[PDB]
């Protein structure tokens, strides 16, 4: 030191440095703490977890993306696993709990190789080559279901729906949830069975009632009620009609005023009396343009003054006030209407058409909500969920949201696999077979990747109270005797380890990302040597 303070970087004593074997041991144990948390919630026998927010709100979910999102951490290695499950939920939306277990399994097998003197890059080079050998092997085993007609294509959507609905709370209703999740895509989809638009399906939760009241409603569900509720709640169309002629207006009902700040100077009583007549002439003109167009229900973004409450009541025109701008886009899609900027552009061709407009009483008081139904197949499907608890209404949203993420992935052509641990076992023996042919220094790299794939089937046996040794040995001996890859772990214990008889189906695009996200993330973690963490 020579007697003078030696400071290279500001906040010297605040920041710490980790290097050597101690830096690698801290990174592996950081993933083991996250893995053992996620391994308990993996599989249909898993368990949820309570998430306490700093504001007092609680969240109960088993989803690895939601648990880690609200989780407050310290070590940066555990924070990298947070965005790992976030990467899985944002794109594919399925298998968020599997990418955390598989990534930590790669790190657990890598720690044993580091202690043997293997360079970390040589470990990462072996996982990259072994990842492409597992994907290419499973790609040859799967078959294309696109040859079936639309009648059988709906069955495959019901198969993968019931699988994603498991492992989560309120899993007893999955039979009806699987039916409602597929019908949303049947109504909203392209004629070529490709590139379906997910944004056309909205998730609207409601707190009350019971879960058995959840049903599909095609239309718009708004939180605003009819203005001046002297009008009937349920609106009915005319005897003969083309429709209800729903009107959408982004302009409030007011006398015309300049957008710029203006000054209207009245220099005489005669000029003031003309403003009185000019005032009432506009409210009479605005209500006549709607009646001449045949419209019935008028939707306003900014609302309107109390003057038009009785005016629209005389003509029997329902009206709503203070509708959000985002909801106006949702309204024009369901009724296939066009937003009318002003009364001068109002025409009968821009009016929307829906089957019925009505409101429900829901509970005792609560609030008044408007419901729109469609008379035929449309481009708008709104999910309606009820529950006796605020936590049930919340989790059921993302429970069906992840279920819709599985169905939209099946819209992509010629990608299907069977779940239940049958995919990881098939890809595990293919990597271990190449290790004997290659040998060399990378022979131990394929072994670590093969032992990591078997952790997912062994984790399924832990939550089901089984023997991971006896279950894994049966799956490996079955793939060697016969080429059928459909044998997997059964956590429901209905027998018939064949996945074909149990109908369990998973998207291949979801399972392919699990290997890519786990292998490519461990490649960056193993390269970390000096760890500089500043004090908070």
């Amino acid at each position: 030191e020579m007697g003078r303070p030696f400071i290279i970087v500001k906040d010297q004593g605040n920041k710490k440095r980790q290097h050597g074997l101690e830096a690698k041991k801290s990174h592996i144990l950081a993933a083991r703490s996250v893995a053992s948390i996620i391994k308990t919630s993996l599989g249909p026998r898993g368990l949820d977890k309570i998430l306490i927010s700093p504001d007092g709100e609680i969240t109960i979910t088993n989803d690895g993306a939601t648990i880690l999102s609200q989780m407050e951490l310290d070590n940066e290695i555990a924070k990298l696993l947070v965005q790992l499950s976030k990467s899985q939920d944002d794109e594919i939306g399925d298998g968020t709990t599997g990418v955390v277990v598989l990534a930590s399994a790669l790190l657990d097998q890598a720690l044993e190789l580091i202690q043997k003197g293997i360079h970390p890059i040589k470990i990462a080079n072996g996982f990259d080559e072994a990842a492409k050998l597992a994907i290419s092997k499973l790609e040859e085993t799967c078959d294309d279901i696109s040859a079936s007609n639309d009648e059988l294509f709906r069955d495959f959507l019901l198969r993968a729906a019931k699988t994603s609905l498991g492992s989560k709370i309120v899993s007893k209703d999955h039979d009806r949830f699987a039916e409602m999740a597929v019908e949303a895509v049947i109504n909203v989809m392209d004629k070529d069975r490709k590139d379906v638009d997910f944004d056309l399906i909205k998730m609207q939760g409601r707190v009350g009632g019971s879960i058995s009241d959840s049903k599909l409603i095609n239309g718009v569900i708004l939180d605003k009620d009819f203005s001046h509720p002297q009008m009937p709640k349920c609106v009915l169309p005319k005897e003969g009609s083309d429709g209800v002629k729903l009107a959408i207006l982004t302009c409030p009902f007011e006398p015309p005023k300049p957008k710029t700040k203006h000054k209207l100077d009245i220099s005489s009583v005669e000029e003031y009396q003309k403003l009185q007549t000019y005032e009432q002439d506009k409210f009479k003109e605005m209500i006549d343009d709607v009646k001449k167009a045949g419209a019935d229900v008028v939707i306003c973004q900014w609302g309107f003054d109390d003057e038009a409450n009785h005016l629209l009541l005389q003509n029997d025109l329902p009206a709503v006030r203070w509708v959000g701008g985002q909801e106006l886009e949702h309204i024009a899609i369901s009724t296939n209407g066009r937003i009318v900027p002003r009364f001068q552009d109002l025409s009968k061709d821009k009016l929307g058409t829906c089957s019925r407009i009505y409101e429900q009483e829901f509970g005792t008081t609560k609030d008044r909500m408007l419901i729109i139904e469609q008379s035929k197949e449309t481009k708008t499907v709104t999910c309606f969920v009820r529950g006796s608890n605020k936590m049930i209404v919340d989790e059921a949203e993302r429970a069906l949201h992840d279920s819709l993420c599985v169905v939209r992935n099946l819209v992509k052509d010629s990608r299907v696999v069977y779940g239940g641990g049958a995919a990881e076992v098939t890809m595990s023996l293919a990597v271990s077979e190449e290790a004997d042919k290659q040998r060399g220094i990378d022979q131990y790299a394929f072994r670590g990747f093969a032992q990591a794939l078997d952790t997912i089937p062994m984790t399924l046996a832990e939550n089901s109270g089984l023997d991971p040794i006896g279950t894994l040995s049966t799956l490996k001996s079955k793939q060697l005797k016969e080429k059928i890859s459909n044998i997997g772990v059964d956590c429901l214990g209905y027998g018939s380890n064949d996945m074909k008889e149990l109908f369990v189906v998973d998207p291949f695009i979801g399972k392919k990302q699990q290997i890519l996200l786990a292998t490519q993330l461990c490649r960056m973690i193993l390269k970390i040597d000096n760890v500089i963490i500043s004090g908070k």
Binding site: K25, R45, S464, D490, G493
Partner: protein, 44 residues
């Protein structure tokens, strides 16, 4: 196959045994560098 037999309770001893092994292997890592003629002395 599931739901039958027994269910394991009080899983903390499973973590206690892991915490005892990890802490014991961490001590064995410092002494490991002193093994063999190529080992080094430890000043305390």
């Amino acid at each position: 196959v599931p739901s039958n037999a027994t269910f394991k309770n009080k899983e903390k001893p499973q973590e206690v045994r892991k915490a005892n092994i990890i802490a014991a292997r961490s001590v064995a890592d410092a002494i490991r560098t002193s093994l063999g003629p190529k080992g080094m002395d430890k000043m305390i």
